[model samples]
Target chain A: GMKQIEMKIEEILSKIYHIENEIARIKKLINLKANKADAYTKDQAYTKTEINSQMKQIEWKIEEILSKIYHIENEIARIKK
Target chain B: GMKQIEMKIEEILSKIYHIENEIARIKKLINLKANKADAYTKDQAYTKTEINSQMKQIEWKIEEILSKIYHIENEIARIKK
Candidate 1:
């Protein structure tokens, strides 16, 4: 019957909608970050290409700070002497 | 023709096959392991959990390195005196 065919198409459409949403949800999970300090915000996507350079910059800053700490330690040692 | 109905279903099944493979391809691009879509949610949590660890390590180390900066200035004062 035509009704049956309409029902079948409706079911398929629902399923297709579900699949599409699943794809969008998975994609959002793929490259996202947090801190709105809120969560689930896709504002930050951390692919290596994007964030590795940032990580490296931060690591360099950390290392540079280390050298400054060393300089401080040396000054302390000098004062002790 | 009743054949028309069956043909449409077959075409949709073929298209659904494409969606499955496309989903898998997207999953593979992430290189995530979970096996089923049921397992897919676990990988979505990568940044949430791993970033927490990284933030603690990087964030706290960054903080710890921070107070030492105050120590640096104190050391400088000692030298000045």
Candidate 2:
């Protein structure tokens, strides 16, 4: 009658799929930055800032995925460590 | 358990780092006024062996991690089926 939560194993669920999604976003950003140079203005010094900001979001997205990998790997390591 | 996902993340990491190093020069690259004369920076966009090496290392590391997870969580699902 007792279903132990701890014994339920990992519900790895769909969290991992987000990693694929983030990588795709990374590609889209790069493609846009490639030849679409005229998308922004010339006089506005803030163009670089805007590009930097978008890239920052990509960095953060990649990082969150990296951290999740770390946690899952660390959990597995504890089994042997 | 999450190795394949991690490998993909590393690939994104190296590609992103490539740009992090290149965006500085890209500012200079911005000077190519109109037309497609200097529109393409082949060296930057193309994957050099140096960058390829990093991606390969990332690929190898991911394989190692994949091997370990298959033994762990990836196979756990096998039993349920």
* Model number with the top DockQ: 1
> Model 1: what is its DockQ?
0.12
After superposition on all C-alphas, the RMSD of every candidate to the true structure, in Å, is 12.9, 36.9
TM-score of 1: 0.41
Chain B only, TM-score of each candidate: 0.41, 0.34
Interface RMSD of 1: 13.0
* Distance from true location, Cα of A41 in model 1, Å: 13
Error of 2 at A47 (Å): 1.4
lDDT of 1 at A71: 81
TM-score of each: 0.41, 0.26
**Model 1, residue B74: what's the lDDT?**
77
Model 2: per-residue Cα lDDT over B1-81, one tens digit each: 356556655765675565555655545554433333434344323235544654565566557656765666764565457
Model 1: residues >4 Å from true position, as ranges?
Answer: A1-44, B1-46, B78-81
Model 2, range A1-81, lDDT digits (tens) per residue? 122321221222233345446555655555555444552234322333454575567556656756776787676556645
Candidate 2 collision pairs: none
- Write model 1 residue lDDT over B1-81, tens digit each, in one string: 678778878877886888898788886656543223232233344555666666677788788887888877777777788
Candidate 1 overall lDDT versus native = 0.69
lDDT of 1 at B81: 81
Residue pairs clashing, model 1: A35-A38
